[PDB]
Amino acid sequence: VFLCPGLLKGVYQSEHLFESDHQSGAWCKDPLQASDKIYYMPWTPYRTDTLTEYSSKDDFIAGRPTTTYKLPHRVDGTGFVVYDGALFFNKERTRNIVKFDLRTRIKSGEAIIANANYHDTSPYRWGGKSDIDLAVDENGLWVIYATEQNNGKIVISQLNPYTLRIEGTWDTAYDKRSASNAFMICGILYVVKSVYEGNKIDYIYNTDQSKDSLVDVPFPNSYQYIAAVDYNPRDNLLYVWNNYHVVKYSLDFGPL
Ligand SMILES: [Ca+2]
């Protein structure tokens, strides 16, 4: 339902929400249930099992939650998304994605991501069990991961959010442990390279005809510990967590 904005050509600092008390974490909004609600999951090794919901940007900055969700399992890494009223996350120490319905607060299902590396086998550059990264864009729900078969290089799959089945799979040429993070826009994977305490998108992979390219799109890295970068196809922004800081970046596009 979202129109492709084009090929990404610029990333800009835009909004700084607050400095959190966790170095790593993720946060997002649900593009398919348009509301002001913000979802928040700070990262704590072997202790992450809660999703916090805020009703607005103001409530979020003020730390006034609407509710907390106790998850049926613990979570690995910062890769979660909320999509069409359901939380998707990587179940701790598995290659499985759990779907958790927020309105009914029950586990809907579980999917095995075939042959996916997990639990600090192929994390992003900072570790944190960030092996499996969910992404939503104009073309739906995606999983970004790596496999032993693809020599630790990023693999992307389309994940049906209704049936939890994989619907398409592409092997890329990019070492996942070399990447800081990654995200999808219009079925194109963008991989971020950055310094931890160059800063750029330096690789793209287009799932339409499976063509990849080396690029150079400067990426802000003001705090030098990128933990999460997730795209939102409703507002065309990046929701970023960087060294305690919770921020949004705006995007500029050329034709695709
Ligand atoms: Ca990501």
Pairwise CA distance, residues 68 & 97, whole Å: 20
Q: Is 216 annotated as a binding residue?
A: no
Between CA 202 and CA 191 the distance in angstroms is 6
What Å resolution does this PDB entry report? 1.6
- Structure-token match 């005809």, residue found: 209
- Cα–Cα dist 116/48, whole Å: 21
Whether the CB-CB separation of 152 and 131 falls below 8 Å is answered with no
Q: Three-class SS of residue 58?
A: helix
Question: Distance from the CA of 202 to the center of ligand 1, in angstroms?
Answer: 15
What amino acid occupies position 86? Answer: A
Distance CA 57, CA 42 (A): 17
C-beta pairs of 151-160 under 8 Å, 24+ apart in sequence: 152/117, 152/122, 152/176, 152/177, 154/179, 154/182, 154/189, 154/191, 154/205, 155/116, 156/184, 156/189, 156/205, 156/207, 157/113, 159/88, 159/97, 159/111, 159/113, 159/134
Give the number of other CB atoms < 10 A from CB of residue 22: 16
For ligand 1, the distance from its centroid to the CA atom of residue 56, given in whole angstroms, is 23
Other beta carbons within 10 Å of 112: 12
Is 86 marked as a binding-site residue?
no
Phi and psi angles of residue 215, each rounded to the nearest 5 degrees, phi first: -135, 180
Answer yes or no: are the C-beta atoms of 220 and 13 closer than 8 Å: yes
In whole angstroms, give the CA distance from residue 248 to residue 129: 23
**Per the annotation, does 133 bind a ligand?**
yes
Cα distances (Å, whole numbers) of residue 174 to 114, 125, 158, 160, 181: 19, 13, 18, 24, 12
> What's the gap in Å between 10 CA and the centre of ligand 1?
17
Alpha carbon of 134 to ligand 1 centroid (Å): 7
Is 252 annotated as ligand-binding?
A: no
Given a contact cutoff of 8 angstroms between Cβ atoms, the answer to whether 6 and 217 are in contact is no
- Ligand 1 centroid, distance to 12 Cα (angstroms): 17
Q: Which two tokens stand for residue 189?
A: 């994977």
Distance 132 CA to ligand 1 centre (A): 9
Exposed e or buried b per residue across 187-211, where buried means at least 16 C-beta atoms within 10 angstroms of its C-beta: bbbbbbbbeeeebbbbbbbbbeeee
